[PDB]
Symmetry: D2
Subunit: 109 residues, 4 copies
């Protein structure tokens, strides 16, 4: 929930996502689109947090990022966007480069 | 099962299937139904949280022949989702349908 | 007009109302309908662009009592929007429906 | 073109890219931005209809690195789409950003 607690969370790992549901079982198409894109580039090692489990987290990640919706994508402790931005980076090669920057070899390469 | 859901929707005049509960909705689409019913002062309706039950979630889509959540039922009859409910709220049809079922909308006066 | 619109949906076996044209649709929701029809090889259909005329945009909603665009009609009867059509595409109902109207789905071929 | 669009967005204090016009929006997401601006007393501003120009439509997505329409610009700074604009409306950041540009929101009165 907290601002200090979320700052830790996003910096904790290279690729961090906030979803409705889980990678195994997403509860929302927008959250799912993110899970599938990560699957396509072969990113198996990322942090996923379920906002349905905690209303304080649901509300807290919005306040932290200044972003009104879920899913939220962080690369390198920095906010990237939601599923629309992510699909866009998937289609124009930008995500492959962002992944390369984190030391992550994308499967589409 | 179509037979169990048949019973469920005949069991109360007003029956809704949501993501979350009326006291804690988990999706703006489901919240829109909740807030519309709150505006009309429809206090006692059965509300079923599909996030708890994967089988109810699929069962209700099969029974309704409708792909998404929320789902609204009046008098055991399928009415629609949030778009239809909002349309009914804006054109007066919801006040009428509720009145024919002996429900007095708070928007009548 | 209800008059003119009733004539439009009964004129052809498959009638769609879209934002845009099948050649260049102007919206993901309308495009989703177009992409489906294409996957089934449905060549002969009437498409009408609601962007062209505000009276059409409002007209088709009041005729179908359906609040959004796209709208799909088969055999003069309202079937639904893009969500309902995807559901039928996935569960095999679209194939059978087309079979009923004497129309060969490409997925059979 | 990047240089051309860069000039275009910097030319006016408020710049929006919509589907349709402020008088006749062709999409709920574009309309939300128009309605939000209207509540702040911003009635006259530069509005470009992407449905009239596929080059501008794609160009603006490339320039902003933002996948969708509407897009809102303030002194040529990208602000975002309707979800962000609505958030700025609710938390008071929109009143504050407009004020810094010498526009006095009707909400401030
Ligand atoms: N265009 C968004 C789609 C995501 C979205 O609109 N999410 C909504 C519905 S799941 C949301 O998080 N609303 C607030 C909430 O439910 O907490 C994106 O690209 O990420
Ligand atoms: N336009 C719909 C909005 C509802 C909707 O698109 N629901 C989606 C997103 S919550 C859904 O039920 N997804 C399937 C699922 O979560 O099981 C309506 O009028 O009800
Ligand atoms: N869930 C809908 C999606 C279509 C939709 O929500 N259409 C909207 C946006 S294009 C609409 O027609 N809104 C009123 C309008 O634009 O006239 C479906 O299954 O067809
Ligand atoms: N979540 C978006 C909603 C706008 C949106 O999803 N726009 C879509 C549908 S109108 C779009 O511009 N799609 C590509 C296109 O039509 O050019 C926002 O916050 O602005
Ligand atoms: S859970 Fe309903 S749209 Fe995301
Ligand atoms: S035109 Fe914007 S969502 Fe259909
Ligand atoms: Cl029965
Ligand atoms: Cl909600
Ligand atoms: Cl009663
Ligand atoms: Cl509109």
């Amino acid at each position: 929930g907290s601002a200090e607690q979320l700052d830790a969370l996003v910096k904790k790992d290279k690729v961090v996502v906030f979803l409705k549901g889980t990678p195994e079982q997403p509860q929302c198409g927008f959250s799912n689109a993110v899970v599938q894109i990560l699957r396509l580039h072969g990113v198996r090692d990322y942090a996923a947090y379920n906002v349905l489990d905690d209303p304080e987290l649901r509300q807290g990640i919005k306040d932290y990022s200044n972003w009104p919706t879920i899913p939220q994508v962080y690369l390198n402790g920095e906010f990237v966007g939601g599923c629309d931005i992510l699909l866009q980076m998937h289609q124009n090669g930008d995500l492959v480069e962002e992944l390369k920057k984190l030391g992550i070899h994308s499967a589409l390469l």
